[PDB]
Amino acid sequence: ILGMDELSEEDKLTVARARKIQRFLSQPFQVAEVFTGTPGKYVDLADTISGF
Amino acid sequence: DAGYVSQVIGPVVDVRFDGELPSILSSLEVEGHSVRLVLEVAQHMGDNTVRCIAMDSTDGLVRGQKVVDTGSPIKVPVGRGTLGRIMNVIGEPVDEQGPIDAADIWSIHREAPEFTEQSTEQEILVTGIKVVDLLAPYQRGGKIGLFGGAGVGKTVLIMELINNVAKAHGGFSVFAGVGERTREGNDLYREMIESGVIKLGAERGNSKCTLVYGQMNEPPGARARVALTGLTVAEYFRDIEGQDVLLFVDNIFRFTQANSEVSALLGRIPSAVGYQPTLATDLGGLQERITTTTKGSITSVQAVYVPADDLTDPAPATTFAHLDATTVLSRSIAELGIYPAVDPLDSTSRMLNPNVIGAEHYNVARGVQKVLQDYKNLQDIIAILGMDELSEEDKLTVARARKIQRFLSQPFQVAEVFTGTPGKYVDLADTISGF
Amino acid sequence: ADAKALDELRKPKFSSKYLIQHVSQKLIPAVKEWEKSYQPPVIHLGRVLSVGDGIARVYGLKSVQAGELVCFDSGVKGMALNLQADHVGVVVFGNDSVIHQGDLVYRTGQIVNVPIGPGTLGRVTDGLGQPIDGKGPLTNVRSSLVEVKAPGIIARQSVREPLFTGVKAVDALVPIGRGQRELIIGDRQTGKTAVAIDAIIHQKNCNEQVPKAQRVYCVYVAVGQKRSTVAQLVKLFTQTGAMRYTIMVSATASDAAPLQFLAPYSGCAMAEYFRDTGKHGLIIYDDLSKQSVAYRQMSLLLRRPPGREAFPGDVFYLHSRLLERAAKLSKELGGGSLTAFPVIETQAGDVSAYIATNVISITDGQIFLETELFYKGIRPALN
Amino acid sequence: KALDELRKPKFSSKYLIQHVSQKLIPAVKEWEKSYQPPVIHLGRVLSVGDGIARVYGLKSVQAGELVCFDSGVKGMALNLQADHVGVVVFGNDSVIHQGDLVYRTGQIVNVPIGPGTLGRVTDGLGQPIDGKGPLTNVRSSLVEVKAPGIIARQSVREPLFTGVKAVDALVPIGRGQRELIIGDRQTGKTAVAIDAIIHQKNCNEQVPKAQRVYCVYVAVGQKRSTVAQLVKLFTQTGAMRYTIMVSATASDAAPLQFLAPYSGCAMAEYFRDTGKHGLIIYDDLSKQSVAYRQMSLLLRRPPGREAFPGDVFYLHSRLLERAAKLSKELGGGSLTAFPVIETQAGDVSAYIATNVISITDGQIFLETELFYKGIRPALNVGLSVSRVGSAAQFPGMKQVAGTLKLELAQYREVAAFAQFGSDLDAATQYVLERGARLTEMLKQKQFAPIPIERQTVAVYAATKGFLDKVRVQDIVAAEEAVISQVNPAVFKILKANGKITPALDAHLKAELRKVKLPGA
Amino acid sequence: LKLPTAPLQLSGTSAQIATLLWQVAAKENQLDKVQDELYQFIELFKQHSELRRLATDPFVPTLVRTKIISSVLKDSGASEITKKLFEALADEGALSALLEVTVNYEELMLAHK
């Protein structure tokens, strides 16, 4: 209701960080590449801890 | 003559009488049970069978066990011989001070007095609580209700009422603990030994309080009639001794709840939210007996549990019409830390007529409700923007109403054991002037 | 299972008689020797088959009408509500604790009557008409049915004369005509009775200024209230003088649920005496939402099929056949009128609840009374 | 026609063919020589199915009496109807047939109570499931015992330390009270209760024999994987020598999950009735009522709200009122109940949650939004109450909790204004950070309960402002810096004196100055 | 136990009575003897109102109903089957079930020939 321009700087730092980890939790699946085209990605456990 | 048990389903027993059934509300004694099991006839089933609710547990009942009719309803000891004692639902002593002296042995089932013996005299009851005595003053002789959900302070408020009203009172008092915790019935007992309200031993006649307990462990037959037992002790002092009685009923919601726990097993198809079809009539027939007639007076204080803070539930909503002063306790006020958590814009009294308490008390009560409703209307802005867009016209009505909300708060004498602050009793002339 | 094999058993098929001729010579000694172990068989009388929660199932009563007053041998009255194939389900006007299994029920042959007339004016009766003010029986009065059919389309005329409440919020904004049904709806403790009281008190102040045919004769029906609340209303109407024109039908909360159901119909029959005789009536059904709970109690105990909020299917028909008796009659029927004021108590303003929805559909407008306007200083809190 | 009176048969029973068989088969002239099935203490199964056997006969069976089927499986005679008995079955009904014999045992339902149950994992009826043999030093007591009355009790004065800092400070618990742990799924309800059991092992080695608390964990409707994880945890800590584990899991019959809280309480009532102190944890009392609803809908008792029976309040009040602090005439023992109720999307207006909230004294309300803000244990300080209150709090902790309960009350109302760090006020901003020192003070890692004296020093270190210099994000490391760097004799004399004496609050005043706090 | 199996299976609780009454009389070779006695009671319920009072009236006590039926049928060469049958139906108040017990006794005798 109020918009992005009314939060604190401490809030809109985490709004941008949580909008980054919301997209980063998504992932192309190897079984979904038949209908999305994007090839799948087996992400290792060390790659997602240090990535996050 | 006797009857035998034909059916046991939980707390509901069918008894079969080969000839001469007992009347409805009659008390039956089960012969051979370990504890004294008393059944009260609820209905005539139709094939020489009555259906009963048991005043104690039914584990150990055998089909064919003999049942003796008593020819009368549940009969309890009444009179001066019960003061300072703790009674059961069936009038038995559970205080371990021996058997109870009997001025009379009265039935717990009665009719409400009549329309002709009603006392139409509204006079104030000075409580000592600021929010009570200002915004919803109690009537000397009338029915008072403390509505609230679980953990808002109805038991504490009824403990403050017991030592602010019943302590300095000419007549006697009866506390009917109806289906609450057994711990706080032992708390109320030991509070009244040390305060001298109940005197043990040889000073027993100098006691000014009768306790009737029907607490949460007991079956729904016991919790449904223990308010009627505690009323009968107060109806003896009102009718036969002709005096001003006090009746504190803790959790009158449990009277309606205990009827609801058996009523599906009594063969009744369910009403609304889970209650019996006879919800207003069970509750109505009890509360019409707690009245000031022309003989004596019963000033009743009834805590009403409101399930999940929902005053639209039919068990708190039916008992609004049976009262003279409703003290709605709120969870919202208690989250601010204001105690007693009396909602100022939901508590109502019939005593707030200016014909009764006078116009000088009436205007400071209506003025406080006006300035607190305005602050509630202004929190739509000043909890969003921050008290800067009001141009000091109604900035001042916020800071007048914010001081009023704290001034309605008050330390209790019984909350000394909770909180480290002494109890404060305020006179009625002082709380008008301070407000 | 079948019928075609069982209808052929009415014909005799025995073709041997070592039992039929023996025991017919031996039946009447065995039956007579337990004559004192018998009750006499009832046909036009009734015997209480089972009783409980104010409902007596009654064997017999072969000739009772639906809705007829029956009387038990305890002197308690009843009302035959559902006549079934094996029993009569009656509702008990009073305590069923004095009613036993095997008690005798006697039909009175009367669909339920109340005393209506000029002598009931100024008295406080119960929900069945019997006086509870303690000043003797009603004199100069006559009996009439409580289930009068309402007047039709052609016995009504247009509602044109104003009925004055005496309240500025009512008489200016939501003005009441002389044969109108106006709901006074709102939450608890919002001043619904106080609107209805002031309409009655204002009729007394107007009755001394009008030429005897514009006089309004009020009826206050108190359903499911306290007896001390009705004692306050009697004191308020006597100390004003309003009970020269007021009847009070009082079925309080300890009264039987058939009496609280029947009290709005009993008060309307007392109010229809003035409508039918060219005078004007005004009736307040205080807590019509407490009549419907009483009718729900009798219905669920009579094992009628429940609807939403467990109300019976005919709970709209309950309130519509009561409130359509408030009419403005045509000039060939005397030109009298009866204006109703049902009072519905909502729960947190929810007027989408089932009984509040039904009575909003029946009446010709609401008086809302919000509880936020009530504490804002606006009293009467007419939204 | 008079024959139409007898057109449709008016039956006053359902098992009529079972009565007329008892009179027509002895009319056969070969069959008067005791070719008869007995009815007094025996029974025949009429119907089986869904774990409800309807049994013909058993004329002398008591209500709630344990019966045995001839297959070995036991049951409980629950409905005593006019012509049959409704028997719920304590196992699988696959081995019960129509016409099987039902023997009454003469006994209302019993469990082994005693000191031989400590250390054992039993099922909901007392049979041990841990594979360590029969129970040895026990006796069989009843399961449905009446709760002790008004005279049998005394006031709840001595505390029961949980080790959770948010409940030893904010929601204090005494020996003998009933504290509900209510919350949503996976919010820390079991973890709060497990930390209460683990802490008693840490405190039973430091108190005399009359001060020890014997825990009982009742696990109703969980998996056997979860219960075996707990017994692995309670053995690794050492809490099993004080703990009973009553385990009616999800594969057990609904009468076994209905009775396991009562059977677990009767074991825990041994310690209450003999002068010792008990602690029973009814994990998922919400799952007991689901088992009681199933058992009652199949017995054709008519349903109410959310299809629950009418007596589902009396199901839980007669269980919970057995947790009492007894008087000195009755040994002075106590039983402390911790019922656990699971809510759905925080809806505590549901039927079973509103019943147990009104029964119990206090409530520890845990939230799933506080749980994911890092506040763990996720205690909602506004909704959490304890109705014994500070009457049974550790003194010293009671001295510092008033500063903690007040500042967190102001920190909550200053919130919903905290999204504007541009809008500094320096009076709200004073308490917006001071309460946030307190909020991250009350965080605690699980399976590590803290001694009560180390907690009240850590609340002293944040209410008196010693940790005002450190940032909000590094107080959980600073609480380690407070504990690991003070003299460990400050805790030895605070536990013995029982309150922060005037000869100590200036000792430990300067003791929290010679520590290094991770903030500068 | 060991009763002869019925000629055709039937419905519930009133055909169950007649099937058991058939299986008992076939064990005793009285399949026409008690069939005729069932017909004899149907006309006997047609003759008297005091005998169909013991099957419709819900205020006749059980003690009156079991004492009358036994004291009337003490003799007359009626079977021990139908004597014990009528004590069983008068114990339970199922005396009105006799009129449709016997039509299930009919089609068992019809399917026996």
Ligand SMILES: Nc1ncnc2c1ncn2[C@@H]1O[C@H](COP(=O)(O)OP(=O)(O)OP(=O)(O)O)[C@@H](O)[C@H]1O
């Ligand atoms: N116009 C008014 N001015 C001042 N006070 C009023 C007014 N109307 C009502 N009140 C007060 O408000 C209270 C509630 O009024 P009233 O009893 O008429 O409401 P109600 O809707 O009948 O409540 P309930 O249905 O619960 O009895 C009364 O005590 C009355 O004194």
Ligand SMILES: Nc1ncnc2c1ncn2[C@@H]1O[C@H](COP(=O)(O)OP(=O)(O)OP(=O)(O)O)[C@@H](O)[C@H]1O
């Ligand atoms: N104080 C805490 N700090 C960190 N993790 C915790 C804490 N308390 C609980 N957890 C973890 O959070 C999760 C919640 O599970 P918990 O044992 O609390 O069960 P619950 O949510 O009460 O019950 P259910 O499993 O039925 O949902 C678990 O992984 C647990 O280990």
Ligand SMILES: Nc1ncnc2c1ncn2[C@@H]1O[C@H](COP(=O)(O)OP(=O)(O)O)[C@@H](O)[C@H]1O
């Ligand atoms: N006047 C008061 N002062 C301080 N605290 C109170 C007061 N009234 C209630 N409380 C708090 O609220 C809790 C509610 O207690 P109680 O009255 O037993 O609840 P209920 O009204 O639900 O029975 C108390 O334990 C206490 O902590």
Ligand SMILES: [Mg+2]
């Ligand atoms: Mg309470």
Ligand SMILES: [Mg+2]
């Ligand atoms: Mg009203």
Ligand SMILES: [Mg+2]
């Ligand atoms: Mg869990």
